[PDB]
Structure 1
Amino acid sequence: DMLIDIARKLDKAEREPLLLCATYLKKLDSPGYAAETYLKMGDLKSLVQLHVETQRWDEAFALGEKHPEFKDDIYMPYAQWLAENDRFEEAQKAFHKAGRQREAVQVLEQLTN
């Protein structure tokens, strides 16, 4: 709560305090606010890694629908997780939502074989 209030009182020019807040919020297992901070700073790659690492798949999917460039970063880990659960129909849909259409085809060809 205090790191949030500080990060909200800090200016957008204060990168070193803001990145120290975001890294402490990650270290303190507070990914929704580390996410708000990475979003305020515009570092979308660290944000999607944060949501995939903290396994917040719903927040990840919502970010990937807003920023199509991260569909691969979210659905590759999730589609691998579906394929490892033998949920290959759902995994094939997940690889497709990732933009990984060639792998969505190759997995189904491999299952057909």
Structure 2
Amino acid sequence: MKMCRSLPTSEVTLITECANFFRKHNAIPFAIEAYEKVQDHQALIGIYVAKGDWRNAFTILEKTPTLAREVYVPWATWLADNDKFD
């Protein structure tokens, strides 16, 4: 994280790949902050649907409406996990 924050603003893009290393290290908030500085919303959506938090995921979905199936599909299963089939 210290190196990733030492990488300048124009070099935040490689931090996207660096954010991948945060998932393999189980560093969730570090991945979140790296991605929001990257402005990568697909992977943020993936992290949010993996952690089960939906408010931030739906705010991100409203930011980029094209990724709806990236949230609805994990949610539709999750609703089926809590017996909300209606």
Alpha-carbon displacement from aligned partner over 1:52-90 (angstroms, at most 9, x marks no partner): 22333332122123222222211221122213433123x
How many pairs were matched up? Answer: 85
With the length of structure 1 as denominator, give the TM-score of the two structures. 0.58
Paired AA for residue 60 in structure 1:
A
- Identical positions, percent: 33
Tell whether 2:50 aligns with 1:62: no
**What's the CA shift for 1:33?**
2.5
Shift of 1:20: 5.0
Aligned-pair Cα RMSD in Å: 2.3
1:86 partnered with 2:64: no
Q: Counterpart of 1:45?
A: 42
Alignment of structure 1 residues 1-113 onto 2, 5 Å: 3=1, 5-14=2-11, 15-16=13-14, 18-19=15-16, 21-89=18-86
SS in 2 for 1:13: helix
Give the Cα separation in 2 of the matches to 1:30 and 1:62. Answer: 22
Residue 20 to residue 67, structure 1, CA distance change in 2 (3 Å): closer
Bigger relative contact order, structure 1 or 2, given CA contacts below 8 A and separation 6+? 2
1:20 & 1:63 partners in 2: Cα distance?
20
The residue type equivalent to 1:44 in the other structure is H
Per-residue deviation, 1:25: 1.9
User: What residue ranges of structure 1 are gaps of 5+ in the alignment?
Assistant: 90-113
Runs of 4+ in structure 1 displaced over 4 angstroms? none
